Design a protein around this motif. Structure first.
Motif, short mmCIF file in Angstrom:
data_model
loop_
_atom_site.label_atom_id
_atom_site.label_comp_id
_atom_site.label_asym_id
_atom_site.label_seq_id
_atom_site.Cartn_x
_atom_site.Cartn_y
_atom_site.Cartn_z
N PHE A 155 0.82 -1.21 0.00
CA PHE A 155 0.00 0.00 0.00
C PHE A 155 0.86 1.26 0.00
O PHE A 155 0.41 2.30 -0.48
CB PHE A 155 -0.97 -0.02 1.19
N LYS A 156 2.08 1.21 0.52
CA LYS A 156 2.96 2.37 0.40
C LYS A 156 3.39 2.55 -1.04
O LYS A 156 3.52 3.68 -1.52
CB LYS A 156 4.17 2.24 1.33
N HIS A 157 3.60 1.45 -1.75
CA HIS A 157 3.94 1.53 -3.17
C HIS A 157 2.84 2.20 -3.98
O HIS A 157 3.12 3.04 -4.83
CB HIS A 157 4.21 0.13 -3.72
N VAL A 158 1.58 1.81 -3.75
CA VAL A 158 0.49 2.35 -4.55
C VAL A 158 0.13 3.76 -4.09
O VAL A 158 0.00 4.68 -4.91
CB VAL A 158 -0.74 1.41 -4.52
N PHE A 159 -0.05 3.95 -2.78
CA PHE A 159 -0.66 5.17 -2.27
C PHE A 159 0.26 6.03 -1.42
O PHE A 159 -0.16 7.10 -0.97
CB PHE A 159 -1.91 4.83 -1.44
N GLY A 160 1.51 5.61 -1.20
CA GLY A 160 2.34 6.29 -0.22
C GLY A 160 2.71 7.73 -0.54
O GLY A 160 3.06 8.47 0.38
N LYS A 161 2.61 8.17 -1.79
CA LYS A 161 3.08 9.51 -2.13
C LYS A 161 1.96 10.48 -2.51
O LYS A 161 2.17 11.39 -3.31
CB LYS A 161 4.13 9.44 -3.24
N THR A 162 0.78 10.32 -1.91
CA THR A 162 -0.40 11.06 -2.33
C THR A 162 -1.05 11.73 -1.13
O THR A 162 -1.24 11.10 -0.09
CB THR A 162 -1.40 10.14 -3.03
N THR B 251 -2.42 22.47 -5.70
CA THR B 251 -1.34 22.99 -6.52
C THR B 251 -0.23 23.58 -5.67
O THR B 251 0.96 23.38 -5.96
CB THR B 251 -1.86 24.04 -7.51
N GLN B 252 -0.59 24.28 -4.59
CA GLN B 252 0.44 24.84 -3.72
C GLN B 252 1.14 23.74 -2.93
O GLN B 252 2.36 23.79 -2.75
CB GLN B 252 -0.16 25.89 -2.79
N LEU B 253 0.39 22.72 -2.49
CA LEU B 253 1.01 21.66 -1.71
C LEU B 253 1.90 20.76 -2.55
O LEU B 253 2.91 20.26 -2.05
CB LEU B 253 -0.07 20.83 -1.02
N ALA B 254 1.54 20.56 -3.82
CA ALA B 254 2.37 19.72 -4.68
C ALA B 254 3.71 20.39 -4.97
O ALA B 254 4.75 19.72 -4.96
CB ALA B 254 1.63 19.42 -5.98
N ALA C 144 5.14 22.71 -3.10
CA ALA C 144 5.89 22.97 -1.87
C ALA C 144 6.57 21.70 -1.34
O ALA C 144 7.76 21.73 -0.99
CB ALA C 144 4.98 23.57 -0.80
N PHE C 145 5.83 20.60 -1.27
CA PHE C 145 6.34 19.28 -0.91
C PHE C 145 6.07 18.40 -2.11
O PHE C 145 4.91 18.16 -2.46
CB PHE C 145 5.65 18.73 0.33
N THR C 146 7.15 17.95 -2.75
CA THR C 146 6.98 17.37 -4.07
C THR C 146 6.29 16.02 -3.99
O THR C 146 6.92 14.98 -3.82
CB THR C 146 8.31 17.29 -4.80
N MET C 147 4.96 16.06 -4.09
CA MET C 147 4.06 14.96 -3.78
C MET C 147 2.79 15.16 -4.59
O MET C 147 2.30 16.29 -4.70
CB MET C 147 3.74 14.93 -2.29
N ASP C 148 2.28 14.08 -5.16
CA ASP C 148 1.00 14.14 -5.85
C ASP C 148 -0.11 14.56 -4.89
O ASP C 148 -0.15 14.14 -3.73
CB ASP C 148 0.65 12.78 -6.47
N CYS C 149 -1.00 15.40 -5.37
CA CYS C 149 -2.14 15.83 -4.58
C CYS C 149 -3.43 15.51 -5.33
O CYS C 149 -3.44 15.33 -6.55
CB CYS C 149 -2.04 17.32 -4.28
N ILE C 150 -4.52 15.40 -4.57
CA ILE C 150 -5.80 15.00 -5.13
C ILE C 150 -6.90 15.44 -4.17
O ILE C 150 -6.70 15.49 -2.95
CB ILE C 150 -5.83 13.47 -5.41
N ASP D 232 -10.09 15.69 -8.56
CA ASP D 232 -9.17 16.56 -9.28
C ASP D 232 -7.76 16.40 -8.72
O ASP D 232 -7.56 16.43 -7.50
CB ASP D 232 -9.61 18.02 -9.17
N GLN D 233 -6.78 16.25 -9.61
CA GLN D 233 -5.40 15.97 -9.21
C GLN D 233 -4.45 17.09 -9.60
O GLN D 233 -4.69 17.83 -10.56
CB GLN D 233 -4.88 14.68 -9.85
N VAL D 234 -3.36 17.19 -8.85
CA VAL D 234 -2.19 17.97 -9.23
C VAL D 234 -0.97 17.09 -9.02
O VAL D 234 -0.80 16.50 -7.94
CB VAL D 234 -2.06 19.29 -8.43
N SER D 235 -0.12 16.98 -10.04
CA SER D 235 1.03 16.09 -10.02
C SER D 235 2.17 16.68 -9.19
O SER D 235 2.20 17.87 -8.88
CB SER D 235 1.55 15.82 -11.44
#
Lengths: 165, 176
Positions: A124-131, A141-144, A146-152, A157-160
């Motif tokens: 589960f860390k492999h699939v979801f750990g970086k979101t 958009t600001q969180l992605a 600032a901390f380089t991490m996928d957001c949703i 709606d997503q920001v890479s």
């Protein structure tokens, strides 16, 4: 919505394991086969949309103990000329590392909302750990960036982490 | 119908549209067809072009002729790493790119993008040992299409990959 080659792979793997079960062979494969990602967690229905959007087809990856279990399933899979595409998450090989999540009122690590047994933690860390699950698409958009991490967001709606939408 | 929409954009931008990647290259032997099919993935149906503008130019063309959309690999600014030379000394494995022949020499950058340093081995146990058995991980594929990623993810299914490895031989000229 779900690809047929994935669904064929699920059924072909169900065939291989049942054959092992009826013939009393490859107990380590049977013990080592844990099913697809989707059948190994629960979460609250509010999170259903952003979890399915983040996971994509990895919802149907097969969680297994090891690479030996994967290739034994595949050796019989291919012996029988079985249809499908299968992807394995082998717990003893996944090289995923732990992620430092930011302190914030605006976001939650998505893995913190998934209820799963800790023996599947590397899967589960492999699939979801970086979101991160964020309140708004404003804040994703600001969180992605600032901390380089996928957001949703909860509506999907997503920001890479690189900055793609 | 997509064959001559394809032939039309090649004559509309000569020197700029090289073609579908499957038409521009061929695995050296038949034994490597399934492994090359697996490693190349959706890139084997990619239309290789010189630049991203001409990619958008061909997007606008197919958009104008009702035809089904295609994917374009612009070459000029492809994010691509050079092929790791030292991996040729690895016993049991050869490079996946070292096992494809390609029509013009420009196309080598498209294969470098699609293959990287992926390795092909003759059997699964070899591919597993090269991928995970050393201190450095390698992306490996066996001849039945079973692929081992550096992340530890494993994938396969040989009859679905055989059914689209036969595409390598059928696009070879219709004698009639």
């Amino acid at each position: 919505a779900t690809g047929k080659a994935i669904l064929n792979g699920i059924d072909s793997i169900n065939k291989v394991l049942d054959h092992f079960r009826r013939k009393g062979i490859n107990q380590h494969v049977q013990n080592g086969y844990h099913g697809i990602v989707m059948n190994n967690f629960e979460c609250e229905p509010a999170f259903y949309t952003c979890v399915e959007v983040t996971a994509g087809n990895r919802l149907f990856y097969h969680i297994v103990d090891s690479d030996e279990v994967s290739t034994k399933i595949l050796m019989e899979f291919n012996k029988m000329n079985l249809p499908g595409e299968v992807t394995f998450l082998p717990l003893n090989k996944l090289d995923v590392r732990d992620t430092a999540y930011p302190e914030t009122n605006d976001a939650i690590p998505m893995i913190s909302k998934l209820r799963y047994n800790p023996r599947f933690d590397k899967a589960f860390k492999h699939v979801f750990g970086k979101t991160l699950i964020c309140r708004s698409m404003e804040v994703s958009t600001q969180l992605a960036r600032a901390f380089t991490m996928d957001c949703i967001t909860l509506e999907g709606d997503q920001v890479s982490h690189r900055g793609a939408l | 119908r997509k064959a001559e929409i394809m032939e039309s954009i090649k004559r509309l931008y000569p020197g700029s549209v090289y073609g579908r990647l499957i038409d521009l290259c061929q695995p050296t032997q038949k034994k490597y067809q399934i492994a090359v099919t697996k490693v190349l993935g959706k890139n084997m149906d990619a239309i290789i072009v010189d630049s991203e503008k001409t990619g958008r130019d061909c997007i606008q063309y197919i958009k104008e002729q009702r035809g089904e959309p295609e994917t374009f690999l612009p070459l000029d600014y492809l994010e691509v790493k050079p092929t790791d030379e030292k991996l040729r000394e690895l016993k049991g494995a050869k490079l996946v790119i070292d096992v494809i022949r390609y029509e013009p020499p420009h196309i080598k950058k498209a294969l470098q993008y699609a293959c990287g340093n992926a390795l092909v081995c003759d059997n699964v146990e070899d591919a597993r040992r090269i991928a995970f058995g050393g201190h450095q991980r390698h992306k490996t594929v066996a001849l039945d299409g079973t692929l081992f990623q550096k992340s530890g993810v494993i994938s396969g299914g040989a009859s679905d990959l055989k059914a689209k490895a036969r595409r390598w031989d059928e696009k070879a000229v219709d004698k009639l």
